[PDB]
């Protein structure tokens, strides 16, 4: 982002290739953004994976089990896309993995914005991997 985060937001807020909007421009409008480096996949300036210098992505990994990728952008290497993302493939237990994500997101003051959301996506991703391994045992409707 040569131009600042706010200007990239103001430039991509209305149509961006990662945005899925349905139900029209009325009060019914549903907006999600589907870029990898967005946590809640909410289209807003807090979360946006394009309008920001500092973003935290947490993805279930390519073909391999129980391995979660945590990546954060590097603030200084913005104009070098191949070398913009710091990824780490952690297969440790949940508690250790969450300690690491706090280390990388909140405790270094990288971006405390996403201290909670990144751990929420970590929870959801980790259990998605669990169930992709075991299968449905709970229905979780109660």
């Amino acid at each position: 982002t040569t131009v600042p985060g706010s200007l990239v937001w103001e430039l991509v807020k209305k149509n961006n290739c990662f945005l899925i909007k349905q139900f029209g421009n009325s009060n019914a409008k549903v907006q999600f953004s589907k870029e990898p480096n967005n946590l809640y996949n909410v289209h807003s300036y807090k979360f946006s994976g394009l309008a920001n210098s500092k973003t935290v992505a947490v993805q279930p990994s390519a073909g391999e089990d129980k391995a979660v990728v945590l990546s954060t952008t590097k603030t200084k290497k913005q104009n070098t896309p191949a070398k913009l993302q710091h990824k780490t493939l952690m297969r440790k237990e949940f508690r250790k993995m969450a300690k690491s994500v706090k280390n990388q997101v909140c405790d270094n003051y990288y971006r405390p914005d996403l201290t909670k959301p990144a751990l929420a996506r970590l929870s959801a991703v980790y259990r998605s991997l669990q169930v992709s391994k075991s299968g449905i045992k709970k229905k979780n409707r109660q």
Partner: protein
Amino acid sequence: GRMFAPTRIWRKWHRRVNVRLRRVAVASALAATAVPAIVTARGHRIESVPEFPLVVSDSAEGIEKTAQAIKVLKQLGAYADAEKAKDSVGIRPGKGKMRNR
């Protein structure tokens, strides 16, 4: 019968824009490409491209074949983008698919 207000050849098919406004627009078209974030948001697959705004040596100018051109785009990170372009090709839906498009 007719149609109401039948179209006529002397509609305003071409519009004019100030020459300086074309120049302003093309400068602000250039200035937006030098941003990886907007090049991405515009839809291009740029995740292995080495640096923006990307530049190659002039020895690229001397090639002749498209095998060589794809060889060139492998070194850069844009052959993913060429692949997107080539695998997205399809028949234009609607009355476009019969008007020579």
